[PDB]
Structure 1
Amino acid sequence: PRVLEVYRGVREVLSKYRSGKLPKAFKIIPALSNWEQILYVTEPEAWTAAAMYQATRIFASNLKERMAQRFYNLVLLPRVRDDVAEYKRLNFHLYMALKKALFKPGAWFKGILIPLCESGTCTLREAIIVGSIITKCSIPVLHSSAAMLKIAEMEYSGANSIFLRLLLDKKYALPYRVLDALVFHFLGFRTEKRELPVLWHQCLLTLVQRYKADLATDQKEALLELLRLQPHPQLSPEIRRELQSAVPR
């Protein structure tokens, strides 16, 4: 009716947005009942990068973790993948949006990180750009470990182990079941004939560099079996060094 004329107007605002106070109709989108119909009129694919940051800034604050997750999954995350493929580097506002998306870590992990690695088509460049934001923003220990467990159980790709390393790089105290998944993750390549990248060894390095205190003799010697079958001229002696100078409990 008349509401369709209001949002078709703001469609032409958000497509040419750069700065300033947004129209008040846009700021009350997650308060609506039929919000997904409204969002399609505004045309999220035709939006400017600057608009995308303030769009994310709205959804992260207005509660509802389930409503927040589905915005990232349908609008935000495709746009990130669209620009890394096109411009090869990410836009500033689009980057700033992702840091603002971490105000709800539950909706972040279930909407951005986990769906990205599950697709399989995730490139190395895509992984580092998003993964650096994990290093910048502090994440709750419960949510940090929960994302870490999924990636450990997940199918292996080059992009996948980058995230896993950066989560261990945070150096939080870990739940014990997560450690069991991480050991089982790396020991899954013990019989593998495939040539493993350097980023894989660095992930195994960071695991032993920090969490050598929480490794029992059973899994500790299972790791020494892993390096004996899948070696590296540079990094494998360092992991061998870190295991031999480890004090348990």
Structure 2
Amino acid sequence: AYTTVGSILKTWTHGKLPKLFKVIPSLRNWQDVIYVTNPEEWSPHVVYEATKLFVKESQKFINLILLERFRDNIETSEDHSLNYHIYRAVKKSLYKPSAFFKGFLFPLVNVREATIAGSVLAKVSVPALHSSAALSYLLRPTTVFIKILLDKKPYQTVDDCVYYFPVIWHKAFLTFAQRDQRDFLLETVRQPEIRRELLA
């Protein structure tokens, strides 16, 4: 019967939120009990209010609600740009990096949606052990995230990158120049700033 309060919580655009919205994470059935309130009908401000309150099931919540709202805002918004509170929720979310990559990083794999996701994912640091795992999993326009993950500056990572041999793809490879199969890469480029810079 708590949905009788949730039907009002959809307007909680300012001030103190209802107590039912603050205590919900304490219940082990919340993965089903949250379906009765259905915050995806709620105002965007609650999405950030929830994203600060939901912080391994956070990947299931981050993938089950956060990624669902992110697609609806970017796809439904009249300018294609996410709402400020949606963006603030995503950039404020991902406080555990595996929840971001496992929740949205891989499942999010048009090009405009990829660009907006990167503009948040480049806005904060990430652990070296976390960043290397994402670069390997990406080694399987999705390279626009690879170009972003390469912009932050292991032997298995170098071995996965060597197999990676539009102007955004050339420039992303050009950034890889910042650091016998290297003869094959030069043979591919011979098929010039990278051929000269590849001589270093």
Q: CA deviation at 1:20?
A: 1.7
Task: Classify the secondary structure of the residue corresponding to 1:74.
Answer: helix
Name 1:192's counterpart in structure 2.
Answer: none
2:16 matches 1:21: yes
Q: Which runs of 5+ in 2 are unaligned?
A: none
CA RMSD of aligned residues (A): 1.4
CA distance, structure 1, for counterparts of residue 175 and residue 186 of structure 2: 15
Q: CA deviation at 1:145?
A: 0.8
Number of residue equivalences: 198
2:81 matches 1:89: yes
C-alpha contact 1:102 1:137 (8 A) present in aligned 2 = no
2:149 matches 1:167: yes
Q: 1:35 aligns with which of 5, 30, 33?
A: 30
Map 1:156-195 → 2, pairs under 5 A: 158=141, 160-171=142-153, 175-186=154-165
CA distance, structure 1, for counterparts of residue 32 and residue 182 of structure 2: 55
Q: CA deviation at 1:179?
A: 1.5
Q: CA deviation at 1:221?
A: 1.9
2:65 matches 1:75: yes
Name 1:239's counterpart in structure 2.
Answer: 194
Q: CA deviation at 1:36?
A: 1.7
Map 1:1-249 → 2, pairs under 5 A: 4=1, 6-13=2-9, 15-60=10-55, 66-87=56-77, 88-117=80-109, 123-153=110-140, 158=141, 160-171=142-153, 175-186=154-165, 197-208=166-177, 210-211=178-179, 218-229=180-191, 237-244=192-199, 246=200
Q: CA deviation at 1:226?
A: 2.1
Q: Which runs of 5+ in 1 are unaligned?
A: 61-65, 118-122, 187-196, 212-217, 230-236
TM-score, normalised on structure 1?
Answer: 0.76
CA distance, structure 2, for counterparts of residue 113 and residue 151 of structure 1: 9
Task: Classify the secondary structure of the residue corresponding to 1:136.
Answer: coil
Q: Which amino acid aligns with 1:39?
A: I
C-alpha contact 1:11 1:43 (8 A) present in aligned 2 = no
Q: CA deviation at 1:32?
A: 0.9
CA deviation profile, 1:119-155 (whole Å, cap 9, x unmatched):
xxxx2111111111121110011011101101111xx
CA distance, structure 2, for counterparts of residue 24 and residue 16 of structure 1: 14
